[PDB]
């Protein structure tokens, strides 16, 4: 069965959480990982892989590494010409031109693509205080995303459209990004960081180690965000 | 009178790595390198101490880093096998129908790789099973231990199976009550 | 708890 | 099958410690296969090769002037630091050994009979154990198993003792150890 939605007690509090929310903020703010056809290179430990990606932007790195949640998954892509997409950090990224790392993001390339160019439009509706408040829709040149690049698209949207995150702290007390697939399996992501002083991005972007992969043209976004009275 | 040791270890090509800390013979605790977390021996410690894990996340990075200019350095000089001494004991004096726990005691060996398993009346016992990481020797091998809870019974056999590059076949110790 | 420390790992001289 | 070359590499950081925090050693040590190859030994206070292979690494690290200080330092800072952090529970840790006396399930000899002092679930690892006939120590005739660590911080020992018992005579198991003030004993009565 998919996963059960969560409950308020089930969602991390901002206002628990007195560290700095612009190190949340960070991680999905025009801040990502893109390669198109490539092979990972090596591999640090047995669930992660090694790939030669430079950083187009500024210059930062030229080598990712992305951890996988088991061996089984390294294996898989291991000899796989694939496509990358994630979100990376640099704080307690370790492994044997500058590093990052990131987890997984990892979908074949082979026959994942739209004949031209073309991108598939994927709906996202925004609740607050559960009422739809916007509408919109994310792109991907995949067909088979992972859904980790729609989450980040996600909330890159709602930081520059509706202050997701901001330096310190975010107008919103909780929030959860779900996912709906066409054969009614859903799953979420809690959106906000663990209470606390101090906010831990590697610990936090584990979560995309399954590598879970969605059908583009099918898959539908609901973002639920509260604000701390309504 | 005492020693604590910070113990770590990159092996290639398996690319097993460990960082675990020691106190006269007995683990405090180790990282979980995939979970990139603190992981106690005893629960107490968690409770009276604390570690930040990333520490032993950098140096595995640097040891391995290390291990392939060594490697090199040696003209790709390979590791002696040096298979296990494997005995099995109980915690306390065995009684029929009390409560035990059988330990397997892998000493002596290296690389720090092996399967281990549980054998009771020939079939491969689960339930309530626990082991121990690889943990330090003076001379450089390493130690593992393995636990069988079990209510004693004039009937069953256990065997502690253990597989290992070292030996030329898996070795059962076979253990049975017999007081 | 009160924090255990490490001793970093030294880099040997590169090739 | 899986019949590839395996390359391992050790680093050992051992704090050595007499008296508590008194007197401390530092021994850094780098392990290639089974060979150590290079060390930095705190009495010595710069690093040493043990074999040819580390000679590349300790001429680099002793060139290293702020890795010298603080590896010297580390004595301190890292030693005599986790001694104090982690003493209340590992240091003071104690648990008293539960002990019992029964004959063995050998017994060779016929008119002998050897007991058995089972001395288990205890920490720390030292202890001693003697046995005593009618009040007087026994020193031949007495064999130990040898002290087991159970790898669970617990240890366990057997000590037995052949005997050529006699109606009335008092065989005592005497146990020293750090978790009780007064000495356990367990007697035997033939």
Same mark, same amino acid.
């Given at each position: 069965?998919?996963?059960?939605?969560?409950?308020?007690?089930?969602?991390?509090?901002?206002?628990?959480?007195?560290?700095?929310?612009?190190?949340?903020?960070?991680?999905?703010?025009?801040?990502?990982?893109?390669?198109?056809?490539?092979?990972?290179?090596?591999?640090?430990?047995?669930?992660?892989?090694?790939?030669?990606?430079?950083?187009?932007?500024?210059?930062?790195?030229?080598?990712?590494?992305? =951890?996988?949640?088991?061996?089984?998954? +390294?294996?898989?892509?291991?000899?796989?010409?694939?496509?990358?997409?994630?979100?990376?950090?640099? *704080?307690?990224?370790?492994?044997?031109?500058?590093?990052?790392?990131?987890?997984?993001?990892?979908?074949?390339?082979?026959?994942?693509?739209?004949?031209?160019?073309?991108?598939?439009? *994927?709906?996202?509706?925004?609740?607050?205080?559960? $009422?739809?408040?916007?509408?919109?829709?994310?792109?991907?040149?995949?067909?088979? /995303?992972?859904?980790?690049?729609?989450?980040?698209?996600?909330?890159?949207?709602?930081?520059?459209?509706?202050?997701?995150?901001?330096?310190?702290?975010?107008?919103?007390?909780?929030?959860?990004?779900?996912?709906? =697939?066409?054969?009614?399996?859903?799953?979420?992501?809690?959106?906000?960081?663990?209470?606390?002083?101090?906010?831990?991005?590697?610990?936090?972007?584990?979560?995309?180690?399954?590598?879970?992969?969605?059908?583009?043209?099918?898959?539908?976004?609901?973002?639920?965000?509260?604000?701390?009275?309504? | 009178?005492?020693?604590?040791?910070?113990?770590?270890?990159?092996?290639?090509?398996?690319?097993?790595?460990?960082?675990?800390?020691?106190?006269?013979?007995?683990?405090?605790?180790?990282?979980?390198?995939?979970?990139?977390?603190? *992981?106690?021996?005893?629960? !107490?410690?968690? $409770?009276? +101490?604390?570690?930040?894990?990333?520490?032993?996340?950098?140096?595995?990075? *640097?040891?391995?880093?290390?291990?392939?200019?060594?490697?090199? &350095?040696?003209?790709?000089?390979?590791?002696?096998? /040096?298979?296990?001494?494997?005995?099995?004991?109980?915690?306390?004096?065995?009684?029929?129908?009390?409560?035990?726990?059988?330990?397997?005691?892998?000493?002596?060996?290296?690389?720090?790789? /092996?399967?281990?398993?549980?054998?009771?009346?020939?079939?491969?016992?689960?339930?309530?099973?626990?082991?121990?990481?690889?943990?330090?020797?003076?001379?450089?091998?390493?130690?593992?231990?393995?636990?069988?809870?079990?209510?004693?019974?004039?009937?069953?056999?256990?065997?502690?199976?253990?597989?290992?590059?070292?030996?030329? =076949?898996?070795?059962?110790?076979?253990? =049975?009550?017999?007081? | 708890?009160?924090?255990?420390?490490?001793?970093?790992? +030294?880099?040997?001289?590169?090739? | 099958?899986?019949? &590839?070359?395996?390359?391992?590499? %050790?680093?050992?950081?051992?704090?050595?410690?007499?008296?508590?925090?008194?007197?401390?050693?530092?021994?850094? &040590?780098?392990?290639?296969?089974?060979?150590?190859?290079?060390?930095?030994?705190?009495?010595?206070?710069?690093?040493?090769?043990?074999?040819?292979?580390?000679?590349?690494?300790?001429?680099?690290?002793?060139?290293?002037?702020?890795?010298?200080? %603080?590896?010297?330092?580390?004595?301190?800072?890292?030693?005599?630091?986790?001694?104090?952090?982690? !003493?209340?529970?590992? /240091?003071?840790?104690?648990?008293?050994?539960?002990?019992?006396?029964?004959?063995?399930?050998?017994?060779?000899?016929?008119?002998?009979?050897?007991?058995?002092?089972?001395?288990?679930?205890?920490?720390?690892?030292?202890?001693?154990?003697?046995?005593?006939?009618?009040?007087?120590?026994?020193?031949?005739?007495?064999?130990?198993?040898?002290?087991? %660590?159970?790898?669970?911080?617990?240890?366990?020992?057997?000590?037995?003792?052949?005997?050529?018992? &006699?109606?009335?005579?008092?065989?005592?198991?005497?146990?020293?150890?750090?978790?009780?003030?007064?000495?356990?004993?367990? !007697?035997? $009565?033939?």
């Amino acid at each position: 069965e998919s996963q059960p939605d969560p409950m308020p007690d089930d969602l991390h509090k901002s206002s628990e959480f007195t560290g700095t929310m612009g190190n949340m903020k960070y991680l999905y703010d025009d801040h990502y990982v893109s390669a198109t056809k490539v092979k990972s290179v090596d591999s640090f430990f047995k669930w992660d892989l090694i790939y030669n990606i430079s950083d187009k932007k500024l210059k930062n790195y030229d080598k990712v590494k992305t =951890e996988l949640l088991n061996e089984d998954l +390294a294996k898989k892509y291991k000899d796989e010409v694939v496509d990358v997409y994630g979100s990376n950090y640099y *704080v307690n990224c370790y492994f044997s031109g500058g590093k990052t790392c990131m987890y997984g993001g990892i979908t074949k390339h082979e026959g994942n693509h739209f004949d031209n160019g073309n991108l598939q439009n *994927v709906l996202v509706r925004v609740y607050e205080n559960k $009422r739809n408040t916007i509408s919109f829709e994310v792109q991907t040149d995949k067909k088979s /995303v992972t859904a980790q690049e729609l989450d980040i698209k996600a909330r890159n949207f709602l930081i520059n459209k509706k202050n997701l995150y901001e330096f310190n702290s975010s107008p919103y007390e909780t929030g959860y990004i779900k996912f709906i =697939e066409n054969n009614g399996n859903t799953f979420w992501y809690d959106m906000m960081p663990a209470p606390g002083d101090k906010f831990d991005q590697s610990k936090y972007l584990m979560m995309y180690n399954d590598n879970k992969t969605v059908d583009s043209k099918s898959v539908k976004i609901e973002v639920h965000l509260t604000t701390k009275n309504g | 009178e005492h020693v604590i040791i910070q113990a770590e270890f990159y092996l290639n090509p398996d690319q097993s790595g460990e960082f675990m800390f020691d106190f006269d013979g007995d683990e405090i605790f180790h990282v979980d390198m995939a979970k990139k977390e603190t *992981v106690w021996r005893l629960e !107490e410690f968690g $409770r009276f +101490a604390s570690f930040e894990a990333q520490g032993a996340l950098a140096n595995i990075a *640097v040891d391995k880093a290390n291990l392939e200019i060594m490697t090199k &350095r040696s003209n790709y000089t390979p590791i002696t096998n /040096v298979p296990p001494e494997v005995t099995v004991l109980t915690n306390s004096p065995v009684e029929l129908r009390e409560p035990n726990v059988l330990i397997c005691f892998i000493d002596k060996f290296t690389p720090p790789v /092996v399967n281990v398993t549980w054998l009771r009346n020939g079939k491969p016992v689960t339930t309530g099973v626990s082991e121990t990481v690889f943990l330090p020797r003076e001379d450089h091998l390493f130690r593992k231990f393995h636990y069988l809870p079990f209510l004693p019974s004039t009937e069953d056999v256990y065997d502690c199976r253990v597989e290992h590059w070292g030996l030329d =076949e898996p070795l059962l110790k076979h253990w =049975e009550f017999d007081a | 708890g009160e924090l255990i420390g490490t001793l970093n790992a +030294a880099k040997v001289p590169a090739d | 099958g899986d019949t &590839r070359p395996r390359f391992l590499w %050790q680093l050992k950081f051992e704090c050595h410690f007499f008296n508590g925090t008194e007197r401390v050693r530092l021994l850094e &040590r780098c392990i290639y296969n089974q060979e150590e190859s290079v060390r930095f030994d705190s009495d010595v206070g710069e690093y040493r090769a043990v074999t040819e292979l580390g000679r590349p690494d300790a001429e680099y690290w002793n060139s290293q002037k702020d890795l010298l200080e %603080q590896r010297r330092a580390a004595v301190d800072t890292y030693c005599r630091h986790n001694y104090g952090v982690g !003493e209340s529970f590992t /240091v003071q840790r104690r648990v008293e050994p539960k002990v019992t006396v029964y004959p063995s399930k050998t017994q060779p000899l016929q008119h002998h009979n050897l007991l058995v002092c089972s001395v288990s679930g205890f920490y720390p690892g030292s202890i001693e154990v003697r046995w005593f006939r009618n009040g007087q120590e026994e020193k031949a005739g007495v064999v130990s198993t040898g002290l087991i %660590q159970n790898g669970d911080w617990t240890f366990q020992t057997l000590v037995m003792l052949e005997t050529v018992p &006699r109606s009335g005579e008092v065989y005592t198991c005497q146990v020293e150890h750090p978790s009780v003030t007064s000495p356990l004993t367990v !007697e035997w $009565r033939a």
